[PDB]
Curated annotation (Swiss-Prot), chain A:
GO terms for biological process: carbohydrate metabolic process. The active site is at residue 475. Catalyzes both the (1) reversible phosphorolysis of 2-O-alpha-D-glucopyranosyl-sn-glycerol (GG) from beta-D-glucose 1-phosphate (betaGlc1P) and glycerol and (2) the hydrolysis of betaGlc1P. the betaGlc1P hydrolysis is a glucosyl-transfer reaction to an acceptor water molecule that produces an anomer-inverted alpha-glucose, not a phosphatase-type reaction. In the absence of glycerol produces alpha-D-glucopyranose and phosphate from beta-D-glucopyranose 1-phosphate. Optimum pH is 6.0-8.0. This is 1,2-alpha-glucosylglycerol phosphorylase. Glycerol binds at residues 327-328. Belongs to the glycosyl hydrolase 65 family. It comes from the Bacteria. Its EC number is 2.4.1.332. One of its GO terms (molecular function) is hydrolase activity, hydrolyzing O-glycosyl compounds. Substrate binds at residues 333-334, 587-588.
UniProtKB/Swiss-Prot annotation, chain B:
This is 1,2-alpha-glucosylglycerol phosphorylase. Optimum pH is 6.0-8.0. Belongs to the glycosyl hydrolase 65 family. Substrate binds at residues 333-334, 587-588. The active site is at 475 (proton donor). The lineage of its organism: Bacteria, Bacillati, Bacillota, Bacilli, Bacillales.
Length: 761, 762
């Protein structure tokens, strides 16, 4: 079957196809149809596109703060620009093109166009274009471009490097220096802020006879190939674009030239990329039985998560990946809570490396905490190269007055720290990797524990500790006390810290305590807090108050009615005076997020009552929200409702359902957290996969829209394949060598000794 | 020496005279020339004026919250409305009238108008009118209205009760019930929120022969008096307006009738009122020698504070007094900090009664604290009858969008509470009234310390207590930590509590400890706070940081430059996103306010450096501001600057230098804190009067604009008269039973003991 939406289809469940051109959606399409490989993102634009169509190659570890405010990745010269003129007429996409198809091939990250258009001289031109960012050679993105006419004609093919590229917050590169080489052009420039060196090398190759002349100017370089096309005789241009910076290698210019020198042909490079992708999908593919739309959407999200994940160096997964510069190519809490689970269970070394990135940027967290008068590690809200805070104090404008507003993402949204500590401990429970904990995880958890202890306030008349003046996952509400989510996360951290102290061997403990100056007095403080911290809990109707006083704010159900108070659509809705501030309308899961992370902590009736309470109060105006509600709905017998949220989360980018711009800030691009959560929705949500103590849990649910699903999950080195249909679950232990496991299925103990177990439901 | 400013003069230094009618200044003229007596305020309007001219009579203890949001005093039917017609033509002030003067006579709280205008039929009519609110008979305001023609002519005088009165936040009275009685009309109504009964009675007397005809409509009642005026023969109308509510007496309609019955003529009632005023002025007058402008401004200010102060019942001094409904007829911190000092030193029973008001409303402070998750006494920001918070969460609007903004005046501005414990202790030190402390004060101070201990946070890794997320006297900065003023006030309270714990008799201490459930755990928390609370102190430059991180906000000097960033003039300047928020611009005294309250705490050089640092960062956009800078400047050798601030301060109402309106809320009216502060600038400021333990201090300074000043202050029961001239200070003990006193003068020496000493001021 094939109809996904708009004018979008899939033929194989591995491909997304868009069969009408619409200039207005350029941007959503450049994001949705992009390619990349963790090193770069190349937007899915056409060969003749420049800044006006939002062409961009975003490159990791090119951070730059040219405008004095926003530190973000650089967009680099585009070595693939290719314009076609036919008898002096430019070939420009018409919404009435005789014939247009665009395809993203998820199985191998190859993005393509096939288009035919009648020119003014009467010739019909067909262009076949395809591009991929090599997963084998991370520094290379490659193009094959084929033009054919149905009529003998004069044409000009103009190809080169465009320096005049889209950059959201200023040009990041200056002092461009042209150079040539045996197969094409080069340019080397330096970054504006830190004067890092960036080189882009173009290779060029044309399989037809032509009059070629070069040109160089301040805006780009390239060459013009003058041809007569013969009717029905195709001409093919192959290109490679290669990027290196001094943050990658000592000599980027030469290393880029050396890369060019050893480049194979397009087809050979594509073959090797495909091998890489075969291996990627054998780790990550999740099958949904008999629902090809949902199968492709899931794969579209997973693919985006993959190409956004750096694996070549210790780098963050950006909250908009490498799709554009939005969100600064930087790690948010999204990285651990939304993007890490798929890796954790499917390829744990990547999860381990996510956390090693956080160990490596601990000094940045230490500087932020110190600068704000705390101790320990207060991780950055927005974390780039070093872990120093990239989130400005002034993220948004009040679009009514034109004045900056001050939001506290960067200094009151403290849960980022114990979120990380939570992820360390999960990584440990899932994998059994004690070494990670000894060499890295204990130091992190101890420093995060120390931070919590320096933030908390002790209230002597109440005899308890509290967490005042924070911002929780529901972004809209700032300056709240005892956010339930935050207090729970803080307690989890302290409990983990105490376990480690009582559980590590004395030589590890001594080395760690010594490294960070951990004293007996700090440890007593922690254990006093363990026993005496206020933690919001279910009240008499079973409801956990989201923060102190939340119950006193205006009830608005359905939440969305609050939009009637807006004066401009692009207002920021939250602090300090947005329409939601004095209301119980929340942006996204908050109390519900707590159950996603601690699914065994509250009984199912409590979860259910909180879901019923909070969901109608929830705007879902963050891409992170629907997946979190889906995961919880699935496990409290709200399976169809979970499915509808699944649908909302998986289509966020494909069907273009969010806003691009808010409070004068651009917030669009590919939704990486959602991309990552697509997997969790199937595996932890419907499947109900969790690891509690050394207990493994499954509670498979199934929406009516699907006949089944099947996924892989690795626990403690054992690879389990879980197959779920309407009447049964089967768990099979692949694993070169099996150890036995005890599983809890719908709460009942069952031993997976042997290879396989089947149970009804 | 005539000229104050606008078109304002004084003739004797006891009167304010305005000689141009200015319709556009209605709000200001009506406040400035009001009358009152602490039970009501009656705005300085003309007898023909109504709602459109902002006529109003504001009556204490008639609180009402008709709009669901603002609990304010009622304006009540106006029993003085009087329109004149002359051969059918109504008499209406024209800005261009043959001649006009209005006069407020401060010696006896009598406001008046004289006006002539030529009418269409060629007659020139002159109206002399005058009113006072009786200080002998607090429920009565009286009018004498005289009319004369230079030409025989028919006329009609229409007088009665206007129901259709100015109210800021909706109609507060309903169910108006018309009645008649021998000497005129009556109307009884009920209040909307609490259904208290309010009656107004009108008495009326005309000394000419006239044909009289009553009317009653749903907007009011009255009578026309048809007359035939003779050239040069005046006709006089006398009225009394009498008001009682069910909050004053069980039977207000009967009690109003009874007062009507025993009302003497206007002249008799005026003589009795003059007598009370003789007595008031002999308690409060402060002389300024050879500067009649400053002399009259001073008196204008003290007159306003006196009439704003209820002395008939345990009620608050409002922050706009009874001049209009603005600020709710209610006690702010202004009451203790700005209005009490004159009473403390001139008539301490009023100072005692102010504190008894705070004691009486302890339960409201206890409800507020409990409502917000605290313990003890969190006194209301805006306090009315019971002590419950009357300040809304949404006080102001963002005028750029029309939406409400939330300001935390009501639940982060915590200093109100230690301000009151401050005031209890100062009252104790000045009077020696140990009984007050035993029966009222100790309980208050204890509850306020218990509040502060529930507010404080302990920071275990810093090993100290802090006061987080407050708002200081500088209203513009909200959500600040460790406001200096606040933490110093909190320490002062904890210290007064610990002194009581250590010095009251066992019996009194047990009764108080038991009444409030004061445990020993609480008491060691207080002592632990005293040794371990963070208190911002002078830094290496001598500067005390206003609140944590204040030094990191934008420097703008002079502060007023910030106003260039305004999009509208009437935007609220402060929190959440006003022009001052991220700047060091402050609304009023804050660190400087601390020196005002604790003038012996830090040395002179520290005070000086803080003055120089903070003054140019200060907008002075609060009427509280200049008096506090005056008082400090005076005493660190900035006497002429002190005197400029004195001038800004005493002219605030007279010269109408402030706004009326800000962020969609009406904040105009008479500036009662400034009124009170006028006294302190002279006495505490130039005079340097303070009490430090058992030490009486004086440091008299003299600005160039004055040849001298003279004032009285009472300290530990002894009435001292202090005369200041260029070269000497004369102190005479005017007590009926003299007892000897120490006295430091410029930090030295003297034991008074004897009727009169003269020291060199050199
Ligand atoms: O006048 C009463 C209040 C007005 N706002 C600033 C406060 O300092 C003051 O008490
Ligand atoms: Ca819903
Ligand atoms: Ca100044």
């Amino acid at each position: 079957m094939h109809e996904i939406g708009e004018h979008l289809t899939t033929n194989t469940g591995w491909d997304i196809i868009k069969n009408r051109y619409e200039a207005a959606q350029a941007i959503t399409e450049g994001s949705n149809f992009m390619i990349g490989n963790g090193f770069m993102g190349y937007r899915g634009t056409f060969a003749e596109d420049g800044k006006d169509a939002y062409a961009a190659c975003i490159v990791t570890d090119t951070w730059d703060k040219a405008d004095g405010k926003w530190e973000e990745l650089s967009t680099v010269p585009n070595a693939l620009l290719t314009l076609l003129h036919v008898d002096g007429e430019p070939f420009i996409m018409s919404e009435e093109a005789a014939s247009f198809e665009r395809t993203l091939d998820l199985s191998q990250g190859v993005t393509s166009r096939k288009v035919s258009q009648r020119m003014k001289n009467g010739a019909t031109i067909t262009i076949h274009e395809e591009k991929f960012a090599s997963y084998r050679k991370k520094h290379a993105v490659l193009m094959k471009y084929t033009v054919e006419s149905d009529q003998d004609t004069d044409a000009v093919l103009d190809t080169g490097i465009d320096y005049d590229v889209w950059s959201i917050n200023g040009d990041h590169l200056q002092g461009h220096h042209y150079f040539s080489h045996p197969t094409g052009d080069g340019v080397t420039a330096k970054t504006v802020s830190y004067e890092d060196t960036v080189t882009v090398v173009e290779t060029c190759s044309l399989d037809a006879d032509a009059s070629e002349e070069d040109y160089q100017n301040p805006d780009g370089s390239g060459r013009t190939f003058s041809l007569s096309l013969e009717a029905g005789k195709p001409v093919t241009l192959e290109k490679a674009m290669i990027i290196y910076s001094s943050n990658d290698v000592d000599n980027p210019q030469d290393e880029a030239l050396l890369e060019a020198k050893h480049m194979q042909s397009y087809e050979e490079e594509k073959a090797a990329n495909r091998l890489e992708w075969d291996n990627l999908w054998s780790h990550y593919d999740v099958t949904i039985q008999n629902n090809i739309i949902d199968q492709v959407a899931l794969r579209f999200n997973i693919y985006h998560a993959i190409i956004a994940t750096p694996v070549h160096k210790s780098l963050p997964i950006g909250a908009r990946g490498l799709s554009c510069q939005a969100y600064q190519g930087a790690a948010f809490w999204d990285q651990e809570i939304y993007n890490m689970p798929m890796y954790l269970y499917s390829n744990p070394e990547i999860a381990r490396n996510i956390l090693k990135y956080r160990h490596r940027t601990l000094d940045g967290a230490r500087r932020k905490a110190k600068r704000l008068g705390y101790e320990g590690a207060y991780y950055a809200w927005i974390s780039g190269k070093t872990g120093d805070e990239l989130c400005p104090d002034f993220f948004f404008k009040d679009v009514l007055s034109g004045r900056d507003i001050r939001n506290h993402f960067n200094d009151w949204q403290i849960h980022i720290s114990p979120d990380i500590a939570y992820a360390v401990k999960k990584y440990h429970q899932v994998t059994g990797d004690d070494a990670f904990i000894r060499d890295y995880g204990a130091e992190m958890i101890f420093e995060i524990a120390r931070f919590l202890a320096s933030h908390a306030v002790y209230k002597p008349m109440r005899g308890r500790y509290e967490f005042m003046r924070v911002q929780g996952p529901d972004q809209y509400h700032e300056n709240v006390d005892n956010n339930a989510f935050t207090n729970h996360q803080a307690m989890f951290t302290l409990q983990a810290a105490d376990e480690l102290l009582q559980t590590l061997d004395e030589k590890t403990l001594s080395a760690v305590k010594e490294k960070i100056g951990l004293s007996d007095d700090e440890i007593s403080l922690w254990r006093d807090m363990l026993a005496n911290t206020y933690v919001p809990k279910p009240d008499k109707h079973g409801i956990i108050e989201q923060f102190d006083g939340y119950y006193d704010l205006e009830t608005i159900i359905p939440a969305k009615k609050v939009t009637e108070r807006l004066i401009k659509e692009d207002e920021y809705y939250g602090y300090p005076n947005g329409v939601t501030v004095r209301t119980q309308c929340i942006k996204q899961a908050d109390v519900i997020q707590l159950f996603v992370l601690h699914p065994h902590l509250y009984d199912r009736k409590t979860v259910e009552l909180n879901y019923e309470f909070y969901e109608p109060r929830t705007l879902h105006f963050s891409s992170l929200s629907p997946s979190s509600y889906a995961i919880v709905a699935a496990q409290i017998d709200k399976v169809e409702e979970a499915y509808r949220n699944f649908r909302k989360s998986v289509m966020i980018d494909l069907l273009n359902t969010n806003e691009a711009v808010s409070g004068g800030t651009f917030i669009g691009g590919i939704h990486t957290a959602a991309n990552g959560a697509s997997w969790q929705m199937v595996v932890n949500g419907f499947g109900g996969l969790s690891v509690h103590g050394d207990d493994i849990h499954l509670s498979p649910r199934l929406p009516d829209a699907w006949d089944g699903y099947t996924f892989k999950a690795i626990v403690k080195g054992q690879t389990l394949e879980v197959d779920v249909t309407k009447e049964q679950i089967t768990i099979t232990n692949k694993s070169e060598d099996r150890k036995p496991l005890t599983l809890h299925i719908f709460g009942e103990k069952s031993v997976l000794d042997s290879e396989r177990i089947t149970k009804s439901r």
